[PDB]
Amino acid sequence: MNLFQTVFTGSKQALAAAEGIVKQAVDEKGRDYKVAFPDTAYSLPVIFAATGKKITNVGELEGALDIVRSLIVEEEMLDKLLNSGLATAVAAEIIEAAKYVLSDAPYAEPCVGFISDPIIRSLGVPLVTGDIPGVAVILGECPDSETAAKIIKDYQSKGLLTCLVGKVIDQAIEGKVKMGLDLRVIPLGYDVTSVIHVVTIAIRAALIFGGIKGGQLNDILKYTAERVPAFVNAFGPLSELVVSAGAGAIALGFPVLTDQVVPEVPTLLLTQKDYDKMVKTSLEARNIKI
Amino acid sequence: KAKSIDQATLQLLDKAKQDGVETVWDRKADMKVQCGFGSAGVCCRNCSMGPCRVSPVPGKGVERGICGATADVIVSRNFARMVAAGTAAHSDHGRSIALSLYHTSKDGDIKVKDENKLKEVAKSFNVETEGRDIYDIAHDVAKEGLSNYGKQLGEVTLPPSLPEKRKELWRKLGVYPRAVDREIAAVMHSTHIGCNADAEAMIKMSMRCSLTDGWMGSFMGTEFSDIMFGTPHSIDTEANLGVLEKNSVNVVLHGHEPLLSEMVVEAASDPELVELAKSVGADGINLCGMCCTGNEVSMRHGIKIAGNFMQQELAVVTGAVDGLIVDVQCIMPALAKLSKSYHTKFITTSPKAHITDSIYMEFDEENPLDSAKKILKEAILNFKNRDQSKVMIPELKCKAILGYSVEEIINKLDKVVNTQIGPMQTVKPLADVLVSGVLRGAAAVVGCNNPKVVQDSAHIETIKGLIKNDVIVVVTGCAAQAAAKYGLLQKEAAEKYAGPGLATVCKLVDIPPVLHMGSCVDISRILDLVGRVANLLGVDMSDLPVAGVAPEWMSEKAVAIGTYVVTSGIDTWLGVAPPVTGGPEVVDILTNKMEDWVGAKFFIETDPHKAVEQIVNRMNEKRKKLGI
Numbered sequence: 001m002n003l004f005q006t007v008f009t010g011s012k013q014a015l016a017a018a019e020g021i022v023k024q025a026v027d028e029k030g031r032d033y034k035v036a037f038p039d040t041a042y043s044l045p046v047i048f049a050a051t052g053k054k055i056t057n058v059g060e061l062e063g064a065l066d067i068v069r070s071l072i073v074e075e076e077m078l079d080k081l082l083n084s085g086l087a088t089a090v091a092a093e094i095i096e097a098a099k100y101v102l103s104d105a106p107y108a109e110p111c112v113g114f115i116s117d118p119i120i121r122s123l124g125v126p127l128v129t130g131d132i133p134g135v136a137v138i139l140g141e142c143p144d145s146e147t148a149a150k151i152i153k154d155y156q157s158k159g160l161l162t163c164l165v166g167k168v169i170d171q172a173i174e175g176k177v178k179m180g181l182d183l184r185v186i187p188l189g190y191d192v193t194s195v196i197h198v199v200t201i202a203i204r205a206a207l208i209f210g211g212i213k214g215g216q217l218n219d220i221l222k223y224t225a226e227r228v229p230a231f232v233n234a235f236g237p238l239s240e241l242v243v244s245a246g247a248g249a250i251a252l253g254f255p256v257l258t259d260q261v262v263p264e265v266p267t268l269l270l271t272q273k274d275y276d277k278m279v280k281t282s283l284e285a286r287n288i289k290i
Numbered sequence: 291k292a293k294s295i296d297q298a299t300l301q302l303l304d305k306a307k308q309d310g311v312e313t314v315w316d317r318k319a320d321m322k323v324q325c326g327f328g329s330a331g332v333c334c335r336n337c338s339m340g341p342c343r344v345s346p347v348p349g350k351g352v353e354r355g356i357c358g359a360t361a362d363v364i365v366s367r368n369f370a371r372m373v374a375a376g377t378a379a380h381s382d383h384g385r386s387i388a389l390s391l392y393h394t395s396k397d398g399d400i401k402v403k404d405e406n407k408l409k410e411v412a413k414s415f416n417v418e419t420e421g422r423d424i425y426d427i428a429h430d431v432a433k434e435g436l437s438n439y440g441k442q443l444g445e446v447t448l449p450p451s452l453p454e455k456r457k458e459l460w461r462k463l464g465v466y467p468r469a470v471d472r473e474i475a476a477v478m479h480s481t482h483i484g485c486n487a488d489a490e491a492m493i494k495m496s497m498r499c500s501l502t503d504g505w506m507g508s509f510m511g512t513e514f515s516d517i518m519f520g521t522p523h524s525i526d527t528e529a530n531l532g533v534l535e536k537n538s539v540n541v542v543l544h545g546h547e548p549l550l551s552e553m554v555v556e557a558a559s560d561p562e563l564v565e566l567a568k569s570v571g572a573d574g575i576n577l578c579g580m581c582c583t584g585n586e587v588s589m590r591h592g593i594k595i596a597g598n599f600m601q602q603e604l605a606v607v608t609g610a611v612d613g614l615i616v617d618v619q620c621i622m623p624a625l626a627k628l629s630k631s632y633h634t635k636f637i638t639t640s641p642k643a644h645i646t647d648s649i650y651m652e653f654d655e656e657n658p659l660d661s662a663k664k665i666l667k668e669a670i671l672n673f674k675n676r677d678q679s680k681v682m683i684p685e686l687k688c689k690a691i692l693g694y695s696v697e698e699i700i701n702k703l704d705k706v707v708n709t710q711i712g713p714m715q716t717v718k719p720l721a722d723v724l725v726s727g728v729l730r731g732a733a734a735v736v737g738c739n740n741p742k743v744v745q746d747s748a749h750i751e752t753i754k755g756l757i758k759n760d761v762i763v764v765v766t767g768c769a770a771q772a773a774a775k776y777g778l779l780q781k782e783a784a785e786k787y788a789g790p791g792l793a794t795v796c797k798l799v800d801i802p803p804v805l806h807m808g809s810c811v812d813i814s815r816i817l818d819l820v821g822r823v824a825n826l827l828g829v830d831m832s833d834l835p836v837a838g839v840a841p842e843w844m845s846e847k848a849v850a851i852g853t854y855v856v857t858s859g860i861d862t863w864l865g866v867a868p869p870v871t872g873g874p875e876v877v878d879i880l881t882n883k884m885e886d887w888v889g890a891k892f893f894i895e896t897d898p899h900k901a902v903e904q905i906v907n908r909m910n911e912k913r914k915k916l917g918i
């Protein structure tokens with residue numbers, strides 16, 4: 001299975017999970033039931049950026065699966081791969097929205113789940129200033145808790161805002177990593193779809209700071225690529241869904257670095273086994289100056 | 291039918307009609323319906339019992355020549371002789387280059403300009419370098435290269451980029467190369483009356499001969515030219531007939547051998563010659579190149595390219611060419627007649643290529659610079675005979691970027707290498723983009739023009755289709771010059787013609803979507819590149835999604851090139867049918883059975899859009915075989 005086929009398989013799995021969870025939400029709560037994220041002004045940010053539509057009820061959430069379906073075209077060209085990554089991102093957002101409408105408190109501490117607009121505005125000032133020179137999106141599991149803690153604290157000591165997805169949260173807790181918004185170590189959630197909660201940070205950064213109106217998807221992608229200094233460090237074995245989510249990160253212009261053997265793409269998808277050089281490799285790949 | 295897609299070509303054809311001079315198009319029209327027997331390859335003249343012609347349609351008419359040779363035998367022998375002639379042309383070019391290398395000296399006209407390249411080549415030839423004088427090394431390297439041409443005992447020396455698997459496959463098949471002249475002689479011997487009358491064996495002998503061109507003759511010529519005249523790097527130039535200057539002396543270098551054109555370029559900066567050009571009433575000296583010698587001087591110095599093969603006559607039709615200096619190969623003899631209608635001095639310089647009624651000034655290899663200065667002085671003095679009322683230079687020229695040797699490509703690829711990962715100075719970024727599928731493949735577009743095809747149409751259509759399908763294109767020779775004239779050799783072309791993956795790659799690496807890798811002998815560079823990629827991936831060259839295209843080929847050299855490209859394991863599309871349709875067995879060998887032998891085969895397709903589609907499908911199926 002080559003890179004394109006891996007991304008397409010991951011996007012289809014994300015679509016299947018989104019369809020299942022949306023069906024569950026439709027069964028339990030009804031199509032008139034409200035759909036929203038806590039304290040946001042852009043409804044579902046990824047769908048709002050891609051199309052301009054605001055998802056307000058469960059029926060509209062079910063109708064948002066058509067966006068995911070139309071974004072998956074299985075032809076081995078780079079544009080289709082980027083669109084398939086975006087389909088995975090939209091599907092992950094739909095899954096997170098369904099989680100919020102199904103459970104009153106989908107995320108428990110230390111996971112924070114969705115990040116509200118006021119937090120985005122608070123982080124915007126140090127973002128453009130340079131006190132936050134980048135965003136380290138750490139996903140998966142490191143071979144040890146010690147190495148995960150070392151990498152996370154290396155990013156933290158450099159001022160980067162690091163977000164954690166997956167078992168790396170538990171490894172960092174075992175590694176005595178101090179977490180919080182002021183400490184710049186944000187645990188999003190144990191599921192892969194929780195990575196969307198940092199993706200919407202970039203998307204809304206284009207909506208708030210950039211002033212790009214909803215539906216101008218190419219302008220949003222250009223803004224995230226040229227303004228948001230985010231990158232992905234994917235540790236541990238990578239499923240097709242993880243690779244598809246990484247394709248979404250690449251579609252947003254965010255390079256993906258991993259310790260796994262993957263079909264490398266220069267400046268976009270890079271393998272770095274040496275955990276002692278992963279921080280420097282990511283800073284170089286994202287062109288970050290400390 | 292239109293004669294060309296190039297507007298400057300069309301304007302000069304109108305001028306040639308107004309001036310009452312004949313062109314290659316006019317002679318093609320005069321030839322009318324060409325002989326069917328010769329077109330199918332079923333005519334034989336190998337002995338004076340003939341001429342013999344057998345039916346191109348099996349089961350009808352005369353079946354055998356007088357000696358009993360079948361249509362397949364006649365076709366296979368004719369094809370083999372074309373391969374032998376092409377191999378001879380390329381090998382003679384490389385032999386001259388090696389002899390020039392052998393005569394290099396510190397204080398002479400010919401020096402060593404790339405010592406690192408010479409040391410790497412010496413490593414490839416098992417020549418010691420440590421603690422040695424550079425010219426002693428150069429002479430030893432030249433001796434080894436010369437031995438490759440005529441050794442009768444032992445094995446020849448092949449470049450390290452050639453995969454071990456490909457060499458083992460050649461040895462098992464029986465096509466492993468011997469000395470170049472020995473293989474040419476073997477082909478000529480086996481086509482003699484009453485020798486080889488088996489099509490498969492004949493084709494295998496021709497493949498064996500073509501390998502000595504691709505991997506020994508052209509390769510050594512290219513690498514020694516780099517050693518003596520400098521490795522090409524990315525450089526700007528201008529292309530098409532508009533580069534001629536009305537108010538300057540115009541000196542057009544046509545042919546293939548680079549030593550003469552290098553010495554002419556050096557002589558053009560001589561203060562006495564510049565002063566002489568001023569004194570004859572010209573603003574200066576304007577050197578322009580055509581065909582492969584133009585490609586060489588343009589790759590290494592940015593000399594403007596006046597035009598490719600079927601434009602050579604039109605260069606004279608402008609009435610502005612004060613001197614036309616030619617060495618060997620692809621020099622239309624009609625130029626001698628044509629220059630009578632203008633003031634142009636048509637100067638032959640090589641004992642290998644005498645042309646009747648041209649001015650012969652033998653280029654002296656013993657004193658190359660002085661000889662080049664004398665020839666250039668004749669061209670400059672001819673400026674006084676210019677008739678400015680007969681001058682018409684089209685205002686049509688195009689910016690081009692070239693100089694993409696393998697070394698230059700590797701240097702460009704270093705830009706997209708993460709320093710914390712590495713390694714540097716490899717083809718690894720290219721291998722990565724090919725394996726990931728961001729690039730679907732790489733295609734080489736090579737070859738001449740041919741009056742049978744609208745000039746430059748097939749080259750341009752094939753190149754645009756390939757780059758639109760995210761296939762990166764490397765170009766050589768007259769195809770490269772067609773791309774230069776059209777405007778494809780530009781960074782902007784990436785966003786104008788390329789597909790998404792290739793556009794992203796071009797933006798990241800800062801290269802045009804079409805890479806000009808030099809002259810016809812520089813096709814060896816392409817081989818080198820492919821080999822490196824294969825050696826990096828641990829596979830044979832036949833496992834890669836690569837292809838070669840000759841949309842508008844005419845020469846025997848093109849036949850030899852396609853043969854050795856297929857024998858190396860690279861599928862080749864021919865835009866002009868070779869004279870083999872009369873032999874069904876030969877057609878079946880070249881287009882079907884060759885894949886069993888060397889993993890690649892010929893594709894005959896005269897429609898460029900269909901050729902692009904077939905190339906994409908073949909690359910995709912090879913990718914699926916490879917798992918990428």
Ligand code: SF4
Binds near residue numbers: 336340341357482
């Ligand atoms: S070699 Fe045979 S087929 Fe050819 S001309 Fe002589 S007799 Fe005829």
